[PDB]
Amino acid sequence: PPRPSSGELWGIHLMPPRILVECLLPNGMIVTLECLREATLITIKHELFKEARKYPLHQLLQDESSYIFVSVTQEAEREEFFDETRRLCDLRLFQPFLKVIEPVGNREEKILNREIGFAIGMPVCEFDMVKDPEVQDFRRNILNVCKEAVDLRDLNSPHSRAMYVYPPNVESSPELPKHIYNKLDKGQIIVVIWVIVSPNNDKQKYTLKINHDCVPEQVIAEAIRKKTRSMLLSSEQLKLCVLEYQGKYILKVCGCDEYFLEKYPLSQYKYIRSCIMLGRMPNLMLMAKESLYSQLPMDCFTMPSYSRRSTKSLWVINSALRIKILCATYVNVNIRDIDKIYVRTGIYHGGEPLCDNVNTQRVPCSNPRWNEWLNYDIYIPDLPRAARLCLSICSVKAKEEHCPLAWGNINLFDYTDTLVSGKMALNLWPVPHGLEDLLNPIGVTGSNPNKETPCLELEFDWFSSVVKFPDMSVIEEHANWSVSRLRENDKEQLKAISTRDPLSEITEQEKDFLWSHRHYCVTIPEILPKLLLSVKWNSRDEVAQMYCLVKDWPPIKPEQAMELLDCNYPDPMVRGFAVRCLEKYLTDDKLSQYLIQLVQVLKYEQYLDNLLVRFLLKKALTNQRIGHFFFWHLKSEMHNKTVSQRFGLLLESYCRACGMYLKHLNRQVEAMEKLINLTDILKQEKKDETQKVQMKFLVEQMRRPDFMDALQGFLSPLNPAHQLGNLRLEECRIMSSAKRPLWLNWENPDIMSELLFQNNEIIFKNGDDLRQDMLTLQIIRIMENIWQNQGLDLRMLPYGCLSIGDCVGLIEVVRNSHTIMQIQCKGGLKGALQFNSHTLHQWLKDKNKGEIYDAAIDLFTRSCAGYCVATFILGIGDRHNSNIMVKDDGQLFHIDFGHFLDHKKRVPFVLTQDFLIVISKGAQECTKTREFERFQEMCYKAYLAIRQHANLFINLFSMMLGSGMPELQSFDDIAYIRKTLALDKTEQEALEYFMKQMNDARHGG
Amino acid sequence: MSLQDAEWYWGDISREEVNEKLRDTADGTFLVRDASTKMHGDYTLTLRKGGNNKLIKIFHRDGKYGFSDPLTFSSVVELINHYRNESLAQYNPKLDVKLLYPVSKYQQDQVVKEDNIEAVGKKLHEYNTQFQEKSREYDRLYEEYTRTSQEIQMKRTAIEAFNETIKIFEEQCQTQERYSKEYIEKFKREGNEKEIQRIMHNYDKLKSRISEIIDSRRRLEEDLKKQAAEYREIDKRMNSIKPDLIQLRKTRDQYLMWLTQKGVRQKKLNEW
């Protein structure tokens, strides 16, 4: 359970109120200074040089002001403490000592690098030491993307700066569907505008009725128009004060930090699109623009120090590919249980071997040396640019049994387009849990930095000079060379192939049929992924001809372009075409929606500097909403050494250009660090102590001032629009789970917090891998968005969930909700030691007396139908009553998906009798009423609605294969959704397949 | 000469299952299923070539068979055996292997003794018990393997911090001697032993503390050396358990062959 810092000193959680500090002067004297834990370095340095006069050779000391302190942190960094305002206890010192030096270098740069280091979790100076030129080129070469973004958002200040920090939270289309429009009063919406008056921050409201598509300035116009009703103003005097207010005020959502800064139709803002959907009252606060811009302090971007300061072609090499395997090291194998070991290799383009695999001879465990030149059945000019060498060390053990010991992947071309040559040595990675394939072509390319790990040495051919991949100039001419060496019934088959999902079987006849009609394929651009898998990538003739087709390919929409960023499309031209589709068709709304997968496919990228990372980094620096989660998704995987460098460098550039938001992120990071350290203490030290002893350590530890100052007054990582003010310590507690997560509750400090939620409570859990719940909850939100746009008002509850690191993260609490097991226990036993099945319906009636009863039943039946379909499709059906929840409102939702995936290592979905009571409004033989009749009609429509978008989901899961989640290690894992969605069958066959599952879901019918 | 009884016809088998059967096999290994489309009389052949599992569709018309528009053969057994005798380069020069190696459904049926039903009801429960136990040991190993792995890098960075602290205390010693040498030499001839012993008393305290952190470093390098070795032991133990775990998992799997002798899964339902 490592940590950037487990405490204020090595092996110590907190410093005593007073400790001794060893101070090393610029003369060789060592002075023991007793100082307070909270003493600022300014106080330390002053009292040190005040005490130094009692020690020899004081004559040699310059004036106090000419020195700073330097020490060693718990990250092993020699840190120069330029920012002398910090408390001794915040330095993360390894040992309590301070070395006095003269400052050198740029102060402001050193103070800023320290702040970045705390943000990304590792010292920036570690990047300075990296030998790899690709790393140093990256650090310098994306600083222009930073400059572009900073210049672009500082262009029309302060508005452009406000649009960066408070970007409009809007749906991707103003065209609201009819089932939403029908909740409008003859095409209009009623909204209430609030204003604060100073003498006591008293407030007044103004109710308006307006067209749903009014722009915010038109809303301000109707509000000032309604208040000047009786002022007897001329048409032009009314204009003058409308103009005054339109340009002087903006609108804010009461209770959180969302603003209406751009002229989208009012109903396109998500807050109001849902107020219509939910039928609630949109509450807006009129606010002065000069007040909003006041809380946007100007923030610069300075280039860092590192920013500033013959060959032949591959297609001339007349020889086949060969690679030398020399020897291995640090191979951990039992010499008496394992017979022999050998090295397995293969040349890959994505996941398809370009040629048959070849192995070294088998060799005794005690002497891992081969010195074999392995020959590959591929002509060097036939190598594609994205070709990779995948290898591993394998053991053999009476039928044989082969197993991998360690793996490693290598790009045959580096980021400069050159072909590797000379002797090479790379440390291999551990084989992931559950993987039994002898090779791992999806794993990252690179050497393992961990020490004393198996190191394999190789050698590549040297062809008298440096070899480079041919420029695009000659590639197109080779296509003109090879190409020299309509139809009807074929038209319907080509289109018949575009319909088939990304994982559908594509036989040899079908793929070379595509390659034959590759020129007609640009009439159905959706076919591009299928056609690309049809190219024989070990033929420079076909690849060159293909490069010319993608150069002129019609843009496909992002939902399809994202497939070309998964691990089956590594060619830089293909991936560059996919990026260009995103940066011109992907809205910030659906960028932020699919951000999880877009960050994940960065792992598949062959090199650090690529078109995709520059696109995401560009967008993250021009939209602080997606830049927030961009940072946290990258941060959450810093521990993983397979990407800690790629993501670290990427985070460095973001934090160096995100502006003043870095200050806010560091308050979040410090808040999480304090929580993860307290839970570690509760999980490692006082795990044996009682639950009340733990509670008293919590209540006492949280009351400490340094803790409250850090956990009070910061933004919620689940949604930075939510401010977290003071703690309601009365409501905080440890929970029942063994990992004992923290139930935390903050006040909402918003001026009008009462109009949204007056207190905000979140669960912090340390010890559970939460990224399974993230992906599941995200996927549920996708399905809900699909249903809503089709007109199915099936209400799901994709509550907030965010992983911030290795098995640690936050979960949003749903207020006024209970589990079905909790509700069963509120009733009584009807049968012989059997809970009353009607207890759920009776509880729901008691919570919804009167005319609101029908609404609760409608909401339960709709939310239930949604989760029945969703959980079946995703294989999340067989849940326990304690993992299903329902609000007093009647809204039903499932929880704890990671627990279910773990508990795995029989029913299509949970449609218990208790639910049928509610759905049928408490009837006998409830499966034969007309409420149930139209309930299973909702399920049918919802099922085929997701099947109609099956491609999107299959692509979303495909992009998560490199994540490291054991549920997603191979495309075979994704086959399950092809089964539930019955993609190799027709609609009616899939419909009947789901109908049979539903008959089995009600446990007989 | 029937297809249902042929070696290389497996029936309702999934694509993911045949991928699990041509894994790392030689070029020419082949196998046919009824197409995943689940449509009667429609099949697919898959053969290993170039480290890939290349699927081809067997078209069917007027009772004839084949896998191209011109269609000829009477039965799939005639279609296959023709390409077992000579190469399918006739169809496409791009791939030119013969259907060399068949993989059959009821060979590798490695149950040898008197086929009493206890070969299932007893020896299956035995192997499955032996499988879940060894699978539980490997999961336990991988847990303390990752635990030891993280505690190691925690120590590797802690000794690396000790290296920086010691580097900083050693430069303090080398600057103590640089700037005190000639004050000692000056105090020596002034006869001021008092001031010489203030400097020495402080120097002694400097390298007295550097001795404490030097000792603290080796005491940690010792813990690291010993935990790094027990880490390599956990690694070779897992590498020894993996092939065994696969061996008796396949044995447990194929001992459902003799459950398939009854077909209806009564004889495992009894163990449920």
Ligand SMILES: CNC(=O)c1cnc(Nc2ccccc2C)c(NC(=O)c2cc(F)cc(Br)c2)c1
């Ligand atoms: C008793 N259950 C099973 O047998 C089972 C078998 N195969 C499966 N594969 C599968 C199916 C659909 C989508 C994605 C996957 C990986 C699943 N579902 C998951 O593993 C799953 C589902 C999520 F929504 C999110 C995450 Br993370 C993982 C379940």
